[PDB]
Subunit: 295 residues, 3 copies
């Protein structure tokens, strides 16, 4: 795209603030940002806030979101679809033109781990170029295993294709499949979808801890066979809904856009790979590490 | 196939009638019928009754089906496999020769949303050419949420490949992936698997309604990540069995041949896309619309 | 690989023995073995014990495994990752060099149907070449339907690609997709992953029996849509955990590495195909048969 040549917009922080007991304001940007998706490989991503996947949003069950999108793309319209909410797609998930803002309001009444993404036609193009992320809605009554969990992280799976190549997007295998982590608490890593960061800087934990992962596979096109090497999932809540309880799963099947909360114990010091067990995708980048130490 | 050149058999209505409290007669045809699968693209489908997917069949739990297949194909044998039933495949799902009929009898003792399809070797060929559909078996005791539902429809996902090209069927990506709807009550739309009909003539509903969809992904080859934009599934019954209850799912993973009953609320007027969230498939046709109005 | 040219190591039996109430010894080999994966097609597989998938291992919930791997490959290191166990991957699933042995110890505390496989980098290469199998961990308290089951078998799904071709493994469609069966009791068949054996020598059962299948899809890359033609699954336990109960499923979605226990009734004499309902994979070999007779 001629108007994107040489464009590399610096990442802008997510803006969020609570404005009442059941209402939150969220402002994001749509922006064009170079990301290093594999060593030596730059992708001029279409992004929320200069991150791909986008920034983590966390709200409470029953929160109404007042969402603003500031579109910094010089020439392409963008939009926002939160899977967490009940909304009219054709009134609430509409396009925001270049250099304009749009504000939209909708309720998040269901707990879980939801995908969000740009909803601009062709949606495959906006997603595949980088406009995806997760919103967590925390359950009013928690999860039944909350008292058991010692540490938590968020992981997101996505794919990368040939740059802005709609033929590749529709008909081709992914070039890369990757994990990222997004921060829940100060000090947590916050990364983009790449083949290397979570290998080189593993997630950290302590021997004997029960770990919770909020996970979502944003696609755009592949399903995920989510597995942590060296353990078994004690508890799995599908889409992060506390009712959809499974126990003792070795691997969790996630559809494209599918989420889960998964919990497992690390019993011994060492490094634990986290994979999709579709090993073609793992080989093309979708392996993260969890380093477990005596401290 | 030389004997199919210029053949376009008019659709024949499904024949069904109840012959006792727990017994139903169903007659279908196998027939060769031109279908417009995308704008300007005709596929000379192998079909049940001149529809692809085939006509909707609905029975009650505990019904014995007395099924007749009249084979109008001039040269290819066909057969019928209902996933709803307990039968001997090698006695009950056998071939019916060109210009002959065969009658078969078997019980449907499990509630759900089942695939049916031709069972003639090579089964991939008969399925991919169009010989697929759904049979719904209604549960004796209903679903626990029956009192909440205001409107219902049936949706079916299937793929189309290069015409009668076994190499493509086994090794290639789908050319099109599509939704159809089949009628449950008078006035409901009844359509074939194409890229456009349910965009141009959306399914209809009223603001505030709880909608039930009976869904099945007949394949032949792809899994489905079933999602309705702008809502969250309140309740999901996997394969349509009332026992397999999930709640608050953003997206439902269906295997090839997999079914579900899903329920959701539309809270605001507008148009709600219904997609598989494998966006390569959505881009190749698998987007339907639900138009929700104040009336 | 020059050092594998002309190498065809005879299969070696699995060695297992119980050494206390909650401790078992298992010795396996890593070895290079020609397998006939389709008629006329030999694959010089990388294997455990000269079988691909490898030998069946069955333990009890709460058993500690003392596992020995003797590496007979003249030049490639191998390792073992059991999904059943809690272990440190970086201490317990490490490489055993050519012509050496390694011993590792870890607990199997969760019941189910687990994948095992070589964990040597690149893991896709070791898996795709044949280093996969299943370990069953029997639940302390059984399954709730145990009293209903008349006969049981184990089935495993895997794929084959172009020989040792990492490009094909990562980016290409499978050449073959296949079932095998592994023996639970004397007289049960024990086969390798091929396109023909379980067609030519079907699994056997008696009219009216409730059949249990322990199943796992080891991949490396595909998901499975597991279906038995002519019946409906009465009960499904996901990953073989008794808590993850589903009922009346026509087809079970298995991720790559995913397992299940499934139970169904065969009501009439005949031959019942067992398929993945991704029919491209079925056409490329993934059809087994169950022959059901009056005796
Ligand atoms: Cu309040
Ligand atoms: Cu506000
Ligand atoms: Cu966009
Ligand atoms: Cu979406
Ligand atoms: Cu703890
Ligand atoms: Cu009666
Ligand atoms: Cu009759
Ligand atoms: Cu046919
Ligand atoms: Cu079938
Ligand atoms: Cu209502
Ligand atoms: Cu004891
Ligand atoms: Cu020992
Ligand atoms: Cu190996
Ligand atoms: Cu593994
Ligand atoms: Cu019995």
């Amino acid at each position: 795209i001629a108007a994107h040549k040489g464009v590399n917009q610096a990442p802008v922080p997510l803006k969020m603030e609570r404005v009442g007991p059941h209402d939150v304001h969220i402002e994001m940007t749509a922006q064009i940002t170079d990301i290093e998706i594999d060593k030596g490989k730059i992708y001029k991503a279409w992004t929320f806030n200069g991150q791909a996947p986008g920034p983590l949003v966390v709200v409470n069950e029953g929160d109404t979101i007042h969402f603003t999108l500031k579109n910094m793309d010089p020439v392409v319209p963008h939009s926002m679809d939160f899977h967490a909410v009940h909304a009219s797609p054709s009134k609430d998930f509409i396009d925001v033109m270049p250099n304009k803002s749009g504000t939209f309001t909708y309720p998040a009444n269901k707990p879980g781990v939801f995908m969000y993404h740009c909803g601009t036609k062709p949606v495959l193009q906006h997603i595949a170029n980088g406009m995806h992320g997760v919103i967590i809605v925390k359950p009013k009554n928690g999860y039944p295993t909350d008292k058991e969990v010692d540490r938590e992280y968020v992981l997101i799976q996505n794919e990368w294709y040939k740059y802005n190549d709609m033929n590749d997007f529709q008909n081709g295998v992914p070039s890369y499949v990757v994990f990222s982590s997004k921060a829940l608490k100060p000090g947590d890593p916050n990364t983009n979808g790449d083949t290397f960061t979570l290998k080189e800087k593993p997630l950290l934990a302590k021997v004997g801890e029960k770990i919770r992962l909020y996970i979502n596979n944003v696609g755009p096109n592949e399903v995920s066979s989510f597995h942590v090497v060296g353990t078994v999932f004690d508890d799995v809540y599908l889409d992060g809904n506390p009712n959809n309880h499974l126990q003792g799963m070795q691997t969790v099947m996630l559809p494209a856009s599918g989420g889960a909360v998964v919990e497992f114990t690390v019993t011994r010091p060492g490094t634990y790979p986290i994979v999709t067990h579709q090993f073609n995708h793992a080989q093309k980048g979708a392996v993260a590490m969890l380093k477990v130490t005596e401290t």
